[PDB]
C-alpha cells in the first residue's frame, strides 16, 4: 500500500544443484544416520 500492486516484496536467494548418479561409500552409526559419505568418481583417493 502507499508509503511515504506491490510485488517481489523482500529478497529471496536459493541454491539449485542437479543430482548425478554416483557410487557413495556410506558410514553407518549405531543410530543409523550416515555420518560420513565419499564419492569414488571425484578423486583417486
Amino acid at each position: 500500500y502507499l508509503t511515504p500492486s506491490g510485488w517481489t516484496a523482500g529478497a529471496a536467494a536459493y541454491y539449485v544443484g542437479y543430482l548425478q548418479p554416483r557410487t557413495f561409500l556410506l558410514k553407518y552409526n549405531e543410530n543409523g544416520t550416515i555420518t560420513d559419505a565419499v564419492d569414488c568418481a571425484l578423486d583417486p583417493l
Partner: antibody
Amino acid sequence: EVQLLEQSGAEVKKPGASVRVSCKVSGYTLPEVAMHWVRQAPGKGLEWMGGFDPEDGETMYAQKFQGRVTMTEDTSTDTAYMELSSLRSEDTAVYYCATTTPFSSSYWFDPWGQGTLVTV
Amino acid sequence: SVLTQAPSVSGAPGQKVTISCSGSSSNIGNNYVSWYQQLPGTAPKLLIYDNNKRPSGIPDRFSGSKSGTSATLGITGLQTGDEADYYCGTWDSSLSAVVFGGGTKLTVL
C-alpha cells in the same frame, strides 16, 4: 497502483424510490482494502458516509445517516452495494466511493470512484 | 460541518500563502489530518496525509503542520491552475466517524 471503477455509473430515481450503489475495483481484490462513502452536494462540502472501521472490524454507518443506508459486499466480484432509502429533499447529491487500508492508521481516502449524482 | 475553515481565500500568483483548519482535541488533537483538492465537477484529490506526508504525484511544494487543535496546510509556489477548494479532515471519536470542514475555495489572483 490501482484504478477505481465508477461508484454506480449513471442512476436516476424519481421521488418514491431508493438506489443501491455498487462500487467495484481493479488491481486489488475487494476484501484486502476497506471502502468508504462521502456525501458531496454540488456547491457544497463533504459529508462522510458508510465506511468500514479498521478497529473492531465492523462496517461503519454514519450516525446522523445511520439506518437509512446499508452496505453489502461480494468479495469475488468486488461489488459493494450502497443502498440509500427514503428519498428526501437535500439528499440528492454526488456520492464518492473511497478506499483506505484495513491495517488501521489510515484516515485518508486514497483512490476515488469519481462520484455519482443521485435523484430524489 | 463540525470544523472551522473559511469559504474562500485569494492571493496573487507565484506567491506563498497557506490555509489552516481549526479543530478540537476531540478531533484533531489525538488524530491525524488529511487534505483534499477538487476542481469544479471533478474527483476530489488527496493532498497531504498525516500533515507531513505527500501522496504519489504531489508537488513537494505542499507541506503541513499541526499545532494543538489547529492544522495548517502548507501551500507554496502558487500556480494559475491551483485555484480550487481544499478540505480538511481528521478522524473523529466523538461521533466515532469521519468529519470534514466546509471547504475553502482558493483563488489565484
